[PDB]
Each structure stands twice: as C-alpha cells, then as structure tokens.
Write a protein that binds this ligand. Structure first.
Ligand SMILES: Cc1oc(-c2ccccc2)nc1CCOc1cccc(Cc2nn(-c3ccccc3)nc2CC(=O)O)c1
Length: 263
C-alpha cells in the first residue's frame, strides 16, 4: 500500500462509518465484550427458574416460555431493523439511491447484519439479552422444546468461528456497510450505483483490515466468505421458520413483510 489522496479518503470513509455506527447502535461489541468478561452485571438465565426470576429483574422494553422467548427475539429484531436503517442512511451515497432500492437493500440485508452483530453479544456459553441486562445460556436455549431448541444453535456456531477473527467495532462498521450495499439483491432498479458504493466500501474494508490486523493476511478473504455463510444462516432460518409456522403463530407483521420475499 501507499499514502495518496485515495487512501486518505478510504480512512476518512472508515472514520465516518465508525462514528455513525457508534450513533446507531447503543450496545457495541466493545461494550458487550466488557460485560461478557466482567470488567465494568447481567442477570444470567441458565434454567426455567432463573428465566422467571430474570423476567422479574430485567426491565423489558416490550403464555409458554419458548413462545415468550420467540416474542422477545421478534421485538429485539424489529428494534434492530430500526437501528440498521438509521445506520444505512449514514452510508455515503445510500440516501441518493432510489427510495425503492434503499428498502430492497435493507429488506434483504437486515437479517445478515442482525446475525453478524448478534455474534458480538455471544460467547461459547451464551448471549447478551435486553441491552446487556441479561445473559441467556446456549444450553438453556438448546433445551427448549422441539423445534425452538434449534433456532439459536447455528447462530452460536457461526459466532464462535466469527468471533475468533477478533474484529472490532471499526472493522464491523465497514463490514456491515459492504453487506448492506449488495448489488445482487432481487428486484433492484439501478445496480450500478450500488456496486460503485460497495467497491469503494470494499477498498475501505481491505485497507482497514491490513492496518488494524497485522497478525493476519487472510482476514479480508475470510470475511468475504463469512458474508456468503450469513446468507446460508438466513436461508436455514427462514425455512426453520416455515417448518414451525405449521404449529401454533403470532409473527410480527414487519418481519412477515421481510420474510415473505425471503421465502
Ligand atoms: C435468544 C434471545 O432471547 C431473547 C429475549 C427473550 C426474552 C425477552 C427479550 C429477549 N433475546 C435473545 C437475543 C437476541 O436473539 C435474536 C435477535 C434477533 C433475531 C433472532 C432470531 C430468532 N430466534 N428466535 C428464537 C425463538 C425461540 C427460541 C430461540 C430463538 N426467534 C427469532 C425471531 C425470528 O425468527 O424472526 C434472535
């Protein structure tokens, strides 16, 4: 690499995305990791008893336990779509795209971003819930009645391998922008303007990674592969949502909208 006006713009892009990311997402990976390691204290949900006690202790913003959990994830999920929408709008050039492509991008992109960021809140033992007020265990989740015990496990599997990459918020800010700016979403009007934004974002990501991670040369290439993996996770998940919606089925109507064309 070289220091030129082009690289300097790539760094300013990265700073700008990082600053928006801090504005849009109140629970950052930095914050989540400090909660997780204990240097900063969440109520842990590890069994049916602690689940009930935690519902008492945790002031939630938003009837059988697996359904209650499903609803919590649905409301968390719609809150995430608002945050991700606010962030997308800060991606330079995004608001100048046709409003229809903006929504198409967000529609096909939000779950990939959701699972990416979910990894930030996970370790091998569990996941942060309710802005870090609670911690729900991987095995408590695996123990929920068929078929709810299989929803979260692939997210945990993805997350332990993803978290071993040791990305930080600065890396993630650009990673997430690349994902939002995918010119290959169905029903896109003007693909070329999107592809131009992404190639630039991609340059900014590759520079950021080289600078921020001297211990690995393979990181950019592994990240590209992670984006493909995320599409599988969303795919696997919507199907699991199909072969379950045949037994209950309150699905949030905003989520219903997003899922229908994902189906
Ligand atoms: C594991 C968990 O639980 C809670 C929580 C509980 C009570 C109150 C408040 C929060 N927060 C988290 C942490 C964020 O997880 C999320 C966040 C976004 C999307 C999903 C996928 C999903 N996963 N499920 C699901 C259903 C039942 C069991 C396990 C998972 N539903 C969905 C919804 C969707 O598919 O759209 C999970």
């Amino acid at each position: 690499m070289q220091l030129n006006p082009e690289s300097a713009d790539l760094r300013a892009l990265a700073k700008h995305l990082y600053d928006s990311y801090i504005k849009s997402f109140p629970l950052t990976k930095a914050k989540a990791r400090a909660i997780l390691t204990g240097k900063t204290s969440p109520f842990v949900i590890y069994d049916m008893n602690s689940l009930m006690m935690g519902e008492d202790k945790i002031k939630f913003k938003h009837k059988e336990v697996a359904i209650r959990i499903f609803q919590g994830c649905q409301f968390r999920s719609v809150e995430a779509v608002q945050e991700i929408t606010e962030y997308a709008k800060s991606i330079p050039g995004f608001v100048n795209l046709d409003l229809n492509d903006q929504v198409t991008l967000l529609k096909y992109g939000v779950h990939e971003i959701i699972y990416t960021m979910l990894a930030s809140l996970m370790n091998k033992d569990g996941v942060l819930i309710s802005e870090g007020q609670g911690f729900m265990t991987r095995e408590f989740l695996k123990s929920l009645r068929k078929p709810f015990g299989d929803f979260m496990e692939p997210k945990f599997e993805f997350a332990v391998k993803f978290n071993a990459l040791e990305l930080d918020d600065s890396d993630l800010a650009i990673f997430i922008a690349v994902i939002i700016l995918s010119g290959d979403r169905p029903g896109l009007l003007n693909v070329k303007p999107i592809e131009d934004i992404q190639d630039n974002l991609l340059q900014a990501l590759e520079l950021q990674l080289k600078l921020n991670h001297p211990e690995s040369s393979q990181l950019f290439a592994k990240l590209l592969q992670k984006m493909t993996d995320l599409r599988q996770i969303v795919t696997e998940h919507v199907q699991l949502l199909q072969v379950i919606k045949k037994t209950e089925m309150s699905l949030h109507p905003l989520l219903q909208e997003i899922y229908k064309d994902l189906y």
